């Protein structure tokens, strides 16, 4: 819980608990007992809804796909949906198992093949690569059930890189890849339908659990432009004769006059 | 058979529930957890760090 | 609700399973079991009684 408020009478002190220093890079400890006359207040609120586990552990949407010919593919990443990508880009390193739930409006009999990294996925339905011996697969009938399965932390390091300030190839190389793109791939999910019944919309809800965030950061203050790319200059009109005009798309509203708001 | 009943709220997917799920990739051993400095446990600890206010946000 | 899961093999009728079934006609009292001579418990006990072989089974 949060601490209670202590009483505070009139104080005439020579050590001001108000005059701090912003330059020292430390925040002030000034509680309202230092500025005014407080009363004892049994305060029992908790920030239990703010800890990383309950903050991120809510099973948001990570990606949508569309079964074209009873087949669709999705490479696991949080980079497509800005709302959850921002909550992740709060922190630098994150370590979490994830719990994938598939909300599909299809009807019939579907199959999900979690392709671990480094192998070839089925390039279409009724491919030979679907008969797999070791690639873990999930069968389900969308009516009567939502398929769900946990992927443990597949990291190749002690955490996930939300931001990576490095490359993967040495200096003189030519196809160097900035960012977190090479640092990790979580495989991919290949969906197919064995029947013909339902729609084609598949939503992948992923819930980070057993989270352990590592380095806080300034939350993203600009709308994204690409994935894995942390650009923010939006090039809105590529066709017209202004393509070289780059919007900014921030969220700082302006007020008409200071000292009047 | 032991008599069970399925009350309302028992074939649904609520995004903010707390359930256990079958581990795909069993036997999987995650890489060890090393000491990275700076671990955070609560976002309010971010909300307690001073940050500048855009006080002159005029047009 | 207690979390239960229905694995594969849990809405099926396998002829050679071993389950309990609800007794229609409850309170029914079967007639008493009297001592009839000759009770058998195992068909191999039949397979241990000598029986003639049709050794001259020509057309």
């Amino acid at each position: 819980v949060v601490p209670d408020t202590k009483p505070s009478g009139p104080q005439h002190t020579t050590k001001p608990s108000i005059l701090g220093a912003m330059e020292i890079g430390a925040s002030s400890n000034a509680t309202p007992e230092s500025t005014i006359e407080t009363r004892y207040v049994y305060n029992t609120n908790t920030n239990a809804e703010a800890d990383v586990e309950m903050f991120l552990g809510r099973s948001a949407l990570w990606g949508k796909v569309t079964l074209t010919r009873q087949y669709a593919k999705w490479e696991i990443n949080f980079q497509e949906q800005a709302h959850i990508r921002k909550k992740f880009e709060f922190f630098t390193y994150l370590r979490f198992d994830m719990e994938v739930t598939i909300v599909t409006n299809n009807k019939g009999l579907m199959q999900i093949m979690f392709v671990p990294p480094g192998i070839d996925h089925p390039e279409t339905h009724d491919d030979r690569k679907w008969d797999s011996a070791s690639n873990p697969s999930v069968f389900f009938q969308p009516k009567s059930g939502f398929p769900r399965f946990t992927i443990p932390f597949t990291g190749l390091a002690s955490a996930y890189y939300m931001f990576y300030d490095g490359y993967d190839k040495p200096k003189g190389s030519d196809n160097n890849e900035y960012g977190i793109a090479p640092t990790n791939d979580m495989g991919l999910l290949c969906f197919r339908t064995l029947d013909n019944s339902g729609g084609n919309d598949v939503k992948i809800y992923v819930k980070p659990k057993h989270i352990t965030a590592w380095v806080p950061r300034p939350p993203r203050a600009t709308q994204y432009t690409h994935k894995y790319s942390t650009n923010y200059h939006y090039k809105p009109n590529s066709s017209g004769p202004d393509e070289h005009v780059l919007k900014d798309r921030h969220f700082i509203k302006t007020r008409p006059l200071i000292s009047s708001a | 058979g032991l008599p069970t009943r399925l009350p309302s709220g028992s074939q649904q997917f609520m995004t903010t529930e707390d359930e256990q799920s079958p581990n795909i990739l069993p036997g999987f051993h995650p890489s060890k957890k090393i000491h990275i400095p700076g671990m955070i446990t609560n976002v309010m600890h971010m909300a307690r760090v001073d940050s500048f206010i855009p006080i002159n946000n005029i047009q | 609700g207690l979390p239960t899961r229905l694995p594969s093999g849990s809405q099926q009728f396998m002829t050679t399973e071993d389950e309990q079934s609800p007794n229609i006609l409850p309170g029914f009292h079967p007639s008493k079991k009297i001592h009839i001579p000759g009770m058998i418990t195992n068909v191999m006990h039949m397979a241990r009684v000598d029986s003639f072989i049709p050794i001259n089974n020509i057309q």
Binding site: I24, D97 | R48 | -
Partner: peptide
Amino acid sequence: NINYYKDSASSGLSRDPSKFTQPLV
């Protein structure tokens, strides 16, 4: 506190602010 899948990664959700706000020597 039962774990129905007999595995750690299958469990549900698990459970000092001076590292920031005072990182002085």
